[PDB]
Design a protein around this ligand. Structure first.
Ligand SMILES: C[C@@H](O[C@H]1OCCN(Cc2nn[nH]c2CN(C)C)[C@H]1c1ccc(F)cc1)c1cc(C(F)(F)F)cc(C(F)(F)F)c1
Length: 479
C-alpha cells in the first residue's frame, strides 16, 4: 500500500501533537490560575497527565513501529510499551471516576465535603500504584523472541491451554479498565443528572416585576378592589388541590384557626387551584362564610398569575412534597415573600432573610407564620422583597453552572466510552467466534480502530474550552 503511507503518518501526528499540547496546557491553566485547584480539576490534572502527557507519547510511536514489525528501537521498550498503556488508562479513567463521585457527593450529600487537598493527593498516588500493579504481571514478562527476518515480543505462559489463561487475564483488565468503571460513572451521572435536570427551570425574562405598572401598593389596592375587598395583608396559594402532595388542606385548616381571632380582619386570602372536589368545597365554604377569602377554580392566564405574584404581599407554599419549588422562584422574582413548608427544593431555595419556613403538615406553625407575616407588614418590607429577587435569581444561576459543569464531565466520559469500545471488542472477538481472515481488509482496520482509540486522548482539552469558559479564557491568556 504505497498510496496509504503518508496518510496514517499524518493521522497519528495530529494525535500526538494536539493531545500533548492540549493536556500540558490544561495542567498549566489549573495550576497557574489563582484558585482553580478544586479536587475535580486535580483529578483532571492526573487525567491530562496519564491520558496524553504519557500515553500518547509512549504508545503512538511504538504501535507505528509495530505495523510492519520494523522495531526501530525494541530494547526494553517492548515490555514498557506493553506495560504502560494499561497503567496510564487505568489512572485516567479512575481519575474521571473520582470526579464523578466528587460531584455525586457534592450534589446528593452536600453536607459531607469528604475530600480534602491531602486526601486528593493520596487518591492520585494510590490510583497510580494500583494501575502499575495491575499491569506488571503482563508487562514485566514481555519477551522478545528472535527470528531470521524480525525480532518481535509477546507475553504468554502455556502450562495449561492458552485460552484458559489468556482469556482470564485479558477479560480481567478489560472489565476493570473499561466496562466496570463506565458502569459506575454511568450510574453516578445518571442520578446526578436526574437531580439537576428533573426541573425544566423558570423563564427569568417572563417572571420579572418590570412587566407590571404602578407601585406594588397600588396594584394590591387594585387587585383586592377587583375581588370586592378593602386593603390588607394579602396571602396567595397556587397549586393543585390534593391531600397527598400540595398542602391546601393545611392552609384551609390554618385559615379556620385564624377565623376565630381578631387579627383575621386585617388579612386577605386568594386560593387558586383545581382538584379534590371536597377541598374546592371547603375553600368555597370559607369564601362564603368569611369574605376576606377569595377562591379561584378557573384556569388562569400565565400573565395574570404574574400579576398576582407581583401584587400580593405573601405567597403560601405549604407543600408536603415539592422537589422543585418553581412557585417559590416565580413568587420571589416578583417580590412575593414566600411562607413555605421546609421540604425538598423549598428549604434549598428559601433562606433566613428570604422567607418564612414552617414544618410541613402543621396548621399550627402555618397559622402562626401567617400572623408573623401580618405583624411584619407593619414595617417596610421592601428590603425583604429585594432579598427574595436577588436570592431567586442567584439560585437559578447556581443551578445553571452546576449543570454546565456536570455536562462537561459527562461529555469527557462519553468520549472514552466511544473511542475504546471498538479497541476492546476487536481484541475480544477471536475467542467464542474464530477470526474471519476471509476479507482483504485486515491491517487497515486495525490501524483505523487503534487510531480512534488513541485519538480519544486529544479530545478532552478541546471539550474543556468548548464547554467551559474558564479554560477557554485560560487559552486566551497565552494560547
Ligand atoms: C484494547 C485493549 O487491549 C488489551 O485488552 C484486550 C487484550 N489486549 C491484548 C493483550 N495484551 N496482552 N495480552 C493480551 C491478550 N492476549 C490474549 C493477547 C490488551 C492489550 C493490548 C495492547 C497492550 F499494549 C496491552 C494490552 C487495550 C489496548 C491498549 C493499547 F493497545 F493501547 F495499549 C491499552 C489498553 C489499556 F486501556 F488497558 F491500556 C487496553
Amino acid at each position: 500500500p504505497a498510496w496509504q503511507i503518508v496518510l496514517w503518518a499524518a493521522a497519528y501526528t495530529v494525535i500526538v501533537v494536539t493531545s500533548v499540547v492540549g493536556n500540558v496546557v490544561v495542567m498549566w491553566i489549573i495550576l497557574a490560575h489563582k484558585r482553580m485547584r478544586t479536587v475535580t480539576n486535580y483529578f483532571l490534572v492526573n487525567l491530562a497527565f496519564a491520558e496524553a502527557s504519557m500515553a500518547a507519547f509512549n504508545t503512538v510511536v511504538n504501535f507505528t513501529y509495530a505495523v510492519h514489525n520494523e522495531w526501530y528501537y525494541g530494547l526494553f521498550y517492548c515490555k514498557f510499551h506493553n506495560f504502560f498503556p494499561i497503567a496510564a488508562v487505568f489512572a485516567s479513567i479512575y481519575s474521571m471516576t473520582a470526579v464523578a463521585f466528587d460531584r455525586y457527593m457534592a450534589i446528593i450529600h452536600p453536607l459531607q465535603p469528604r475530600l480534602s487537598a491531602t486526601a486528593t493527593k493520596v487518591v492520585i498516588c494510590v490510583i497510580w500504584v494500583l494501575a502499575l500493579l495491575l499491569a506488571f504481571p503482563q508487562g514485566y514478562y514481555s519477551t522478545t523472541e528472535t527470528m531470521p527476518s524480525r525480532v518481535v515480543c509477546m507475553i504468554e505462559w502455556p502450562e495449561h491451554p492458552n485460552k484458559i489463561y489468556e482469556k482470564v487475564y485479558h477479560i480481567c483488565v478489560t472489565v476493570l479498565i473499561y466496562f466496570l468503571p463506565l458502569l459506575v460513572i454511568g450510574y453516578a451521572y445518571t442520578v446526578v443528572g436526574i437531580t439537576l435536570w428533573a426541573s425544566e427551570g423558570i423563564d427569568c425574562s417572563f417572571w420579572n416585576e418590570s412587566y407590571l405598572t404602578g407601585s406594588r401598593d397600588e396594584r394590591k389596592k387594585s387587585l383586592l378592589s377587583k375581588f370586592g375587598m378593602d386593603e390588607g395583608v394579602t396571602f396567595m396559594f397556587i397549586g393543585r388541590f390534593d391531600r397527598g402532595q400540595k398542602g391546601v388542606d393545611v392552609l384551609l385548616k390554618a385559615i379556620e384557626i385564624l377565623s376565630s381571632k381578631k387579627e383575621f380582619q386585617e388579612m386577605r386570602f386568594i386560593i387558586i387551584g383545581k382538584g379534590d372536589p371536597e377541598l374546592e368545597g371547603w375553600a368555597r365554604s370559607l369564601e362564603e362564610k368569611h369574605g376576606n377569602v377569595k377562591v379561584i377554580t378557573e384556569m388562569l392566564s400565565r400573565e395574570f398569575v404574574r400579576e398576582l405574584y407581583g401584587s400580593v404581599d405573601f405567597v403560601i407554599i405549604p407543600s408536603y412534597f415539592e422537589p422543585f419549588g418553581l412557585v417559590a422562584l416565580e413568587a420571589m422574582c416578583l417580590g412575593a415573600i414566600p411562607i413555605a413548608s421546609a421540604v425538598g427544593g423549598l428549604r434549598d431555595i428559601i433562606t433566613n432573610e428570604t422567607g418564612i419556613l414552617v414544618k410541613a403538615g402543621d396548621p399550627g406553625e402555618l397559622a402562626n407564620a401567617i400572623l408573623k407575616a401580618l405583624e411584619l407588614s407593619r414595617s417596610d418590607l421592601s428590603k425583604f422583597r429585594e432579598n427574595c429577587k436577588k436570592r431567586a435569581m442567584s439560585f437559578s444561576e447556581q443551578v445553571s453552572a452546576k449543570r454546565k459543569v456536570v455536562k462537561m464531565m459527562i461529555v469527557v466520559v462519553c468520549t472514552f466510552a466511544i473511542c475504546w469500545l471498538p479497541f476492546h471488542i476487536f481484541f475480544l472477538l477471536p475467542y467464542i467466534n474464530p477470526d474471519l481472515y476471509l476479507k482483504k481488509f485486515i491491517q487497515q482496520v486495525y490501524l483505523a480502530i487503534m487510531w480512534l482509540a488513541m485519538s480519544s486522548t486529544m479530545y478532552n482539552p478541546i471539550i474543556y474550552c468548548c464547554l467551559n469558559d474558564r479554560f477557554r479564557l485560560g487559552f486566551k491568556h497565552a494560547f
